[PDB]
Amino acid sequence: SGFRKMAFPSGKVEGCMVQVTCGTTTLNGLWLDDVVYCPRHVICTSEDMLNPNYEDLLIRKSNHNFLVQAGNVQLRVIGHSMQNCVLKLKVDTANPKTPKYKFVRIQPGQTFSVLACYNGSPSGVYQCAMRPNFTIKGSFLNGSCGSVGFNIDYDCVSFCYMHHMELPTGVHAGTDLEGNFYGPFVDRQTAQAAGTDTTITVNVLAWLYAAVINGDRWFLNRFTTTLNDFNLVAMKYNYEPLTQDHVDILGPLSAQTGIAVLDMCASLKELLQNGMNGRTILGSALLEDEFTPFDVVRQCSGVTFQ
Amino acid sequence: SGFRKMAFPSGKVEGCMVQVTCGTTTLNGLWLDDVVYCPRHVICTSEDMLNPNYEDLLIRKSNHNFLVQAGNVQLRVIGHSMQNCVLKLKVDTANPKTPKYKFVRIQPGQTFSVLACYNGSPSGVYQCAMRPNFTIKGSFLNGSCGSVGFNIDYDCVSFCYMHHMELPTGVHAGTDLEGNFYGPFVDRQTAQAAGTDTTITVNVLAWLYAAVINGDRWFLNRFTTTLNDFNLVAMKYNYEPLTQDHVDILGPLSAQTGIAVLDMCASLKELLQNGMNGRTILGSALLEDEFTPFDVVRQCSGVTFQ
Ligand SMILES: *[C@H](O)[C@H](C[C@@H]1CCNC1=O)NC(=O)[C@@H]1[C@@H]2[C@H](CN1C(=O)COC1CCCCC1)C2(C)C
Ligand SMILES: *[C@H](O)[C@H](C[C@@H]1CCNC1=O)NC(=O)[C@@H]1[C@@H]2[C@H](CN1C(=O)COC1CCCCC1)C2(C)C
């Protein structure tokens, strides 16, 4: 028993992290086979970053301008190209530690692990969710760009995020590994802002089921509700709508606990309308929305990875 | 910016995890050089575990009774011995992935990363603190025994915890890597209970400094207090006493924020006496006590590991 915000083991990704330096700028790259991926703003300098034209900036660059550090071994760059907001640096050595991998793009509401890195060296690992407004609430300092987010499925790493920037409210924005930004953000230094966020309703319900599985039951009740009547309550409290597909996804957790999904919705309603009255749920005094139904089943059942 | 519960990269420990099976029991082992460490209750069966005599049970065992799985490679056991509550299985192959390491015992209030494992395969990684009552609030299921806790300092892994058991309140107990239990627990199936816990005061203050560094300032005030007057408030709210050494350890964080330690104590007092009034601090509606001053400095400054 117990419930923690759990990341995937990071070993498979650690073996892919490299340092990329161009001019004044040092950031992280992801080395898979004979390509290093990194944010294209590495080719920028502090006055380039106000409003750059990256095609113009990149044609002015040479292979030898890119210094790639694989620990204490330098990688020879033999080609470079730009793919949307990422650079692909072709090197003359394939990474012998390349895991099986996929480039996937995730949906708002889904979770992933982040391996935060500085100078190509991993610093720590933590779990994030993609917010509905396409930001992530991360922990990133100067030099963390190019750190990646990922999930692991048995032995395959699905890379879903590469870090590019911090917005003025302290939240973070970045791209998938094809270089396409999540959300309406651009890799320029102009006034950008996150935009209004909402709470991920289906994840809150999943976490309430995790609490029941772990013996926290005080928030349960005999009442029930309809999906439509629940969603009127969700709208007022800035929760996003619950769909029938969400109800279906919660089915396993419903069946394991014997608590009908719509019954747990009735409990959430009372929690939204009444607060928590000085009590806690799974060690939290807030309704937590960064665990997916998959996360709960994985943790409350013991799935591993090889 | 941002503040997350961050674990250490787990790659160095993943390469040490093996599966140990004896009779009916399968658990995890830690393979360093030519020794595999694991909980000694692997030699038990379900009626042995009520009240066993481990010396009697172990003399009845043979090397060939211990089946050690290093992924899809079997390790030949060539000797076995017991050290307190851990077994040391000598194998004929040194682990080529052995990191530089140390066996250290931690203090209540300190933090570490846990690599949860099943059948020798890592499942996830998360950060824990050793509670004042010597339990940890983990996430562990059947088969997780032998998963280890650790810190990394540059390139050296300091192993501090090996998992043995779950207590009736859902918290967890285990040993250091010398096999000595943290706290007054024993590896038998008899009525044991955690005992009363307290909040780790110095860690709460560290986390309040992390919040200031990240722009959460609403809980600050112009008042101050003396160390003695603070500790009278801490006693009532079941916080442990703050010492002058704690004040000294908080010095760096005090100097970076310009908020005197005793001033932050005055803020904590008002938070304890008034609650939080519907607001949050670093995304939490509770006072968080599982970040050490070191954890805050590491995260709010960007230290890496090679
Ligand atoms: C890359 O290491 C760095 C990571 C930032 C620094 C602080 N926290 C982080 O996550 N990214 C940048 O420096 C980017 C680069 C320059 C400006 N950056 C910012 O993060 C500044 O934040 C603003 C957000 C919207 C308005 C413009 C940028 C770009 C975006 C090229
Ligand atoms: C080892 O994989 C297992 C891990 C437990 C199972 C559930 N969650 C966990 O962390 N440990 C045990 O099964 C130990 C073994 C047998 C009983 N165990 C318990 O955890 C049962 O909990 C009780 C706690 C105090 C009273 C006796 C045990 C021992 C302790 C040998």
Side-chain angles (χ1 to χ4, degrees), chain A residues 1-177 179-306, chain B residues 1-177 179-306:
Chain A
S1 84
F3 203 75
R4 283 271 187 190
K5 199 157 262 173
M6 205 175 279
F8 289 98
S10 61
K12 281 182 180 62
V13 182
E14 297 169 47
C16 302
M17 293 321 297
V18 306
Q19 192 174 198
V20 179
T21 296
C22 192
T24 300
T25 301
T26 292
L27 59 81
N28 305 283
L30 185 76
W31 181 23
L32 304 164
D33 296 316
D34 69 338
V35 176
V36 169
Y37 305 79
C38 73
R40 71 178 176 174
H41 75 255
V42 69
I43 72 188
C44 284
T45 67
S46 301
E47 67 274 36
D48 292 354
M49 276 165 204
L50 288 164
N51 195 348
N53 180 280
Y54 286 103
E55 291 98 320
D56 271 335
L57 293 190
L58 185 57
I59 186 63
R60 292 178 199 167
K61 283 261 163 272
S62 314
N63 286 344
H64 75 79
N65 295 152
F66 296 98
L67 165 68
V68 173
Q69 298 295 321
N72 48 17
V73 186
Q74 193 183 9
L75 288 188
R76 170 162 144 80
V77 175
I78 64 171
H80 59 272
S81 62
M82 183 172 60
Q83 172 158 21
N84 307 300
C85 299
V86 299
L87 276 177
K88 302 175 38 163
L89 304 180
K90 193 200 185 174
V91 297
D92 65 16
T93 312
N95 184 1
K97 289 183 198 73
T98 303
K100 306 173 138 167
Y101 71 95
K102 295 199 298 223
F103 290 169
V104 306
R105 191 182 170 92
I106 60 166
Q107 283 299 310
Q110 309 183 228
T111 58
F112 55 101
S113 300
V114 167
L115 179 67
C117 293
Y118 302 86
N119 312 288
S121 292
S123 172
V125 68
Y126 55 89
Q127 192 76 349
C128 291
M130 177 64 63
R131 301 305 310 170
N133 65 2
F134 291 102
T135 66
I136 73 177
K137 289 182 190 273
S139 175
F140 288 120
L141 301 172
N142 283 342
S144 63
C145 287
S147 304
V148 300
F150 61 95
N151 287 288
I152 300 178
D153 291 330
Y154 192 45
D155 59 340
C156 180
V157 180
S158 298
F159 294 102
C160 56
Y161 177 83
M162 179 173 278
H163 187 51
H164 290 247
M165 62 192 260
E166 179 169 306
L167 297 173
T169 51
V171 299
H172 297 106
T175 65
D176 63 26
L177 270 291
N180 301 302
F181 265 96
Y182 289 101
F185 310 108
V186 298
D187 51 353
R188 290 185 271 140
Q189 173 153 351
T190 70
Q192 308 182 66
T196 65
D197 210 16
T198 55
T199 299
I200 308 150
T201 307
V202 63
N203 288 0
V204 175
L205 294 167
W207 172 79
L208 289 178
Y209 279 108
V212 172
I213 290 171
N214 285 96
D216 271 338
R217 316 182 46 98
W218 62 262
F219 52 85
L220 291 185
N221 55 60
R222 148 201 189 165
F223 323 109
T224 198
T225 189
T226 50
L227 188 43
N228 290 349
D229 278 343
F230 177 76
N231 279 313
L232 283 181
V233 175
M235 185 179 288
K236 184 286 172 173
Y237 290 96
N238 191 215
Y239 271 53
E240 69 194 347
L242 198 68
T243 66
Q244 187 56 50
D245 195 50
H246 294 146
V247 175
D248 291 346
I249 291 175
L250 293 167
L253 285 173
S254 192
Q256 189 198 335
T257 62
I259 304 187
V261 176
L262 279 297
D263 286 358
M264 191 69 84
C265 286
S267 296
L268 183 44
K269 186 183 288 184
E270 308 291 326
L271 285 170
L272 286 174
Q273 275 170 206
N274 296 329
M276 277 190 39
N277 207 335
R279 292 169 282 201
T280 59
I281 298 176
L282 285 173
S284 177
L286 291 181
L287 301 173
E288 172 78 35
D289 80 342
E290 298 208 348
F291 298 96
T292 68
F294 174 98
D295 293 341
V296 173
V297 173
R298 169 181 65 122
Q299 189 162 167
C300 302
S301 174
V303 171
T304 45
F305 315 89
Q306 292 218 249
Chain B
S1 84
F3 203 75
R4 283 271 187 190
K5 199 157 262 173
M6 205 175 279
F8 289 98
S10 61
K12 281 182 180 62
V13 182
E14 297 169 47
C16 302
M17 293 321 297
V18 306
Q19 192 174 198
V20 179
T21 296
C22 192
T24 300
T25 301
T26 292
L27 59 81
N28 305 283
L30 185 76
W31 181 23
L32 304 164
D33 296 316
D34 69 338
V35 176
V36 169
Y37 305 79
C38 73
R40 71 178 176 174
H41 75 255
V42 69
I43 72 188
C44 284
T45 67
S46 301
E47 67 274 36
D48 292 354
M49 276 165 204
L50 288 164
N51 195 348
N53 180 280
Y54 286 103
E55 291 98 320
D56 271 335
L57 293 190
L58 185 57
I59 186 63
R60 292 178 199 167
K61 283 261 163 272
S62 314
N63 286 344
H64 75 79
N65 295 152
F66 296 98
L67 165 68
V68 173
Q69 298 295 321
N72 48 17
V73 186
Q74 193 183 9
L75 288 188
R76 170 162 144 80
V77 175
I78 64 171
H80 59 272
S81 62
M82 183 172 60
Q83 172 158 21
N84 307 300
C85 299
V86 299
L87 276 177
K88 302 175 38 163
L89 304 180
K90 193 200 185 174
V91 297
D92 65 16
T93 312
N95 184 1
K97 289 183 198 73
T98 303
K100 306 173 138 167
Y101 71 95
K102 295 199 298 223
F103 290 169
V104 306
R105 191 182 170 92
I106 60 166
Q107 283 299 310
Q110 309 183 228
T111 58
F112 55 101
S113 300
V114 167
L115 179 67
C117 293
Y118 302 86
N119 312 288
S121 292
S123 172
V125 68
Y126 55 89
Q127 192 76 349
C128 291
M130 177 64 63
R131 301 305 310 170
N133 65 2
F134 291 102
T135 66
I136 73 177
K137 289 182 190 273
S139 175
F140 288 120
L141 301 172
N142 283 342
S144 63
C145 287
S147 304
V148 300
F150 61 95
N151 287 288
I152 300 178
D153 291 330
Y154 192 45
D155 59 340
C156 180
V157 180
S158 298
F159 294 102
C160 56
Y161 177 83
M162 179 173 278
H163 187 51
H164 290 247
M165 62 192 260
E166 179 169 306
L167 297 173
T169 51
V171 299
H172 297 106
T175 65
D176 63 26
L177 270 291
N180 301 302
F181 265 96
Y182 289 101
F185 310 108
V186 298
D187 51 353
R188 290 185 271 140
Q189 173 153 351
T190 70
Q192 308 182 66
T196 65
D197 210 16
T198 55
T199 299
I200 308 150
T201 307
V202 63
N203 288 0
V204 175
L205 294 167
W207 172 79
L208 289 178
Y209 279 108
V212 172
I213 290 171
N214 285 96
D216 271 338
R217 316 182 46 98
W218 62 262
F219 52 85
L220 291 185
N221 55 60
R222 148 201 189 165
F223 323 109
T224 198
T225 189
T226 50
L227 188 43
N228 290 349
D229 278 343
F230 177 76
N231 279 313
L232 283 181
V233 175
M235 185 179 288
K236 184 286 172 173
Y237 290 96
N238 191 215
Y239 271 53
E240 69 194 347
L242 198 68
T243 66
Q244 187 56 50
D245 195 50
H246 294 146
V247 175
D248 291 346
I249 291 175
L250 293 167
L253 285 173
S254 192
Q256 189 198 335
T257 62
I259 304 187
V261 176
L262 279 297
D263 286 358
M264 191 69 84
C265 286
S267 296
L268 183 44
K269 186 183 288 184
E270 308 291 326
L271 285 170
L272 286 174
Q273 275 170 206
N274 296 329
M276 277 190 39
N277 207 335
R279 292 169 282 201
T280 59
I281 298 176
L282 285 173
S284 177
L286 291 181
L287 301 173
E288 172 78 35
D289 80 342
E290 298 208 348
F291 298 96
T292 68
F294 174 98
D295 293 341
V296 173
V297 173
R298 169 181 65 122
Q299 189 162 167
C300 302
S301 174
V303 171
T304 45
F305 315 89
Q306 292 218 249

